[PDB]
């Protein structure tokens, strides 16, 4: 048979992405598949004046 | 606020390997053209 209704309320949650906030303006993001390729981990800048 | 929203990319950038391409037709005409172009970018806009 049929019975009484039930009062339920589900919250709504806003989900975040890194590329979708303004914080990604300061950074420059690239995709590096494995960080184990970068073993030396040192970068040399050659500045000309 | 001015213009109310900023336009940007949608997925992380990837790296391109475009260092070498010269395996095709080493010849005098393209040689002259390349020298002219890469020297003319200095002055011209």
């Amino acid at each position: 048979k049929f019975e009484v209704l039930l009062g339920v309320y589900t919250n709504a949650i806003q989900y975040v992405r890194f590329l979708e906030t303004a914080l990604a303006v300061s950074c420059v993001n690239t995709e590096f598949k494995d960080l184990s390729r970068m073993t030396d981990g040192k970068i040399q800048f050659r500045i000309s004046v | 606020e001015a213009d109310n929203q900023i336009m940007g990319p949608s997925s992380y950038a990837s790296f391109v390997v475009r260092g070498e391409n010269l395996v095709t037709a080493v010849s005098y005409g393209r040689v002259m053209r390349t020298f002219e172009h890469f020297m003319a970018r200095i002055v011209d806009s």
């Binding site: 420059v28 690239t30 030396d40 040192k42 970068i43 040399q44 050659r46 000309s48 | 950038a13 790296f15 391109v16 390997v17 475009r18 260092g19 070498e20």
Partner: peptide, 22 residues
């Protein structure tokens, strides 16, 4: 830092070969 080798080619970020990229 790996003195004795050859430089083969370059990966690029930002699609511009200028000094601005890494």
């Amino acid at each position: 830092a790996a003195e004795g080798l050859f430089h083969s080619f370059d990966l690029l970020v930002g699609k511009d070969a200028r000094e601005a990229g890494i």
